[PDB]
Design a protein around this nucleic acid. Structure first.
Ligand SMILES: [Ca+2]
Ligand SMILES: [Ca+2]
Length: 293
DNA sequence: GGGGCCGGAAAATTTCTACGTCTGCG
DNA sequence: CCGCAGACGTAGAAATTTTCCGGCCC
């Protein structure tokens, strides 16, 4: 099977990373190891997606990262052209685009075979210093002048609903909340978490989907925004119809279907009856984390 | 030949997904 | 009072990254 190119980009914004590995490998003459890698790590539950991504790009190796996680890795340099080609037509809009643009700069250095010289390594370590989590402590002390490269910031809009379909397939959550004598209410909930570095992008969802709210949640010293929709009228009229015209991917798609089954049962006002609550309870206990198959 | 390149597993780190609740409201 | 839902919590694991041996192969 295959995946829509914008959906894949939306999924690449959610999951997947751009890696640059640098390592000292010799010293009699000083040499360094350099490798680029794009990798999407998923649960083996969604191994089908990686195979589908592998079916569209026709490159990359699926590895088993252990701990219930399979991973699609692409590292072959000639096969990297395929990925670059794709993301020029269907670009990322999150802050991962910055990690992507720096990833391309590393590709340019390795392509001109400059990474085999002292000038290329010194340039590459500056690129890595602004990518993801930056340089390791070894390279920080080996190359002290490593804060020269500019981290390209990103302020982009949502390209279309096709991108949103892929972004929801990764970060989305369709939950049937059974809120609990004054405690037995049924609630449908659709929320999306994201790092606060993409606050502008997250807030665009409210104006783009014409509904929803955003709440910041803190764990220890970390922070992430959560775009949330709870109003049922906004769900049945604005949230559900969107993901129907633009189909999701993975097992999250069937989670969406069961999420719709409850919605149709709620609009029919069967969620306030004894009978209609039974099939809802059966649905909620067999979806998301409630299912293992 | 030999050294950069690459299949492949896996540790490091955290940003997610999942799922409640308290509370005011009409 | 019942039902809706805004605002706001925590668990913990599916994720985001980084790691590098062995050994093809240009
Ligand atoms: Ca993400
Ligand atoms: Ca996901």
């Amino acid at each position: 099977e295959s995946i829509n190119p914008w959906i894949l980009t939306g999924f690449a914004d959610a999951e997947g990373s751009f890696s640059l590995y640098i390592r000292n490998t010799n010293d009699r003459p000083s040499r360094y190891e350099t490798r680029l890698t794009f990798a999407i790590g998923l649960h083996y539950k969604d191994k089908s997606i990686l195979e589908n991504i592998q079916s569209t790009w026709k490159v990359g190796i699926i590895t088993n990262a252990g701990n219930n996680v399979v991973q699609l890795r692409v590292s072959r340099f000639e096969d990297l052209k395929v990925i670059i080609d794709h993301f020029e037509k269907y670009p990322l809009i999150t802050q991962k685009l910055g990690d992507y643009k720096l990833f391309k700069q590393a590709f340019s250095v390795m392509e001109n075979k400059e990474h085999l010289k002292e000038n290329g390594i010194k340039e590459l370590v500056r690129i890595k210093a602004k990518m993801n989590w930056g340089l390791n402590d070894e390279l920080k002390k080996a190359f002290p002048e490593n804060i020269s490269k500019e981290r390209p910031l990103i302020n982009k809009n949502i390209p279309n609903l096709k991108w949103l379909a892929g972004f929801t397939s990764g970060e989305g959550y369709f939950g049937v909340i059974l809120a609990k004598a004054a405690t037995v209410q049924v609630r449908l909930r659709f929320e999306i978490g994201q790092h606060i570095r993409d606050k502008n992008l997250m807030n665009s969802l409210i104006t783009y989907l014409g509904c929803g709210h955003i709440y910041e949640k803190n764990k220890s010293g970390r922070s992430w925004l959560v775009y949330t929709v709870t109003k049922f009228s906004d769900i049945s009229d604005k949230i559900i119809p969107v993901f129907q015209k633009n189909t999701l991917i993975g097992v999250k798609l069937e989670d969406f279907e069961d999420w719709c089954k409850v919605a149709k049962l709620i609009e029919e006002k069967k969620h306030l009856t004894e009978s209609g609550l039974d099939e809802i309870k059966k649905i909620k206990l067999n979806m998301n984390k409630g299912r293992v198959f």
